[PDB]
Amino acid sequence: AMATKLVIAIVQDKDANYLSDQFIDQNVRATKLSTTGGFLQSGNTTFMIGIEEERVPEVLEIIKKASHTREEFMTPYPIKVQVGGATVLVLPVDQFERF
Amino acid sequence: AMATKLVIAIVQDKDANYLSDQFIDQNVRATKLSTTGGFLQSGNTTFMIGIEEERVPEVLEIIKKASHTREEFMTPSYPIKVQVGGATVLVLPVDQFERF
Amino acid sequence: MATKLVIAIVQDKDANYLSDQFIDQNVRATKLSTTGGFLQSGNTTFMIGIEEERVPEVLEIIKKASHTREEFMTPSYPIKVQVGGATVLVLPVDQFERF
16 A cells, blocks of 8 residues: 655755755655756756655655746846746656665 | 557667657657666666657657667777667556556 | 565665675665655665566565664663664566667
């Protein structure tokens, strides 16, 4: 009855710190890779998360809050500029073990 | 309401440059990792692609062309024909896919 | 064809022996270096495309190579310290190609 799923969240380096700390204080075993992506093929991070099915939406909301797309004020006259964004996918898991 | 899959493509560092560019000019959101593999446990690169089911075959063809196994002529630091490239790829189902 | 993918997350200290194990065992693993755990420290992840029939074989290779245990460590009176431990999940795959 151990219905397990894997969530893969791709996320911006900026938000990756706060998120990973969130996961911990939220009792979520995440493992973090660093990747590239985007038009400019810049750096970002990817998370992989073995989690029980029942808890997924908990996890997704954790992410949304941490890394949703927003705009902020930035100076090179400050300007509103867009930051953040997360793409995430949750895969099924046939079997899950800890050794 | 659009069934998406995830393709994972493992590929030669040599061809990863061209491919990744291809993905972009062809509107494929791939994310690229730096890995090791093979008998020598040397460096290659892995790709991860969240894409709609209907589009998978397209993506595979993009890969095959960009990274299939071939032979090339190479002089050793008189020339000889050696094998290069090669790509392994898996496509797996995804239950749910969100952008935030 | 009946391919499955195993992701195995495993401690840096065990990863060398494991990766050699895979090779000598005709298992094609690809290896990422990642971080995880409470302290957010380096470990390593493996991804392994494999015929369904061989999964338990692979799993055993892993359990043996990376299971959790205690060893004798000296702080820089030897002491028993716990080490290793792996966590692994095997997922289905719809389609597998080599090019």
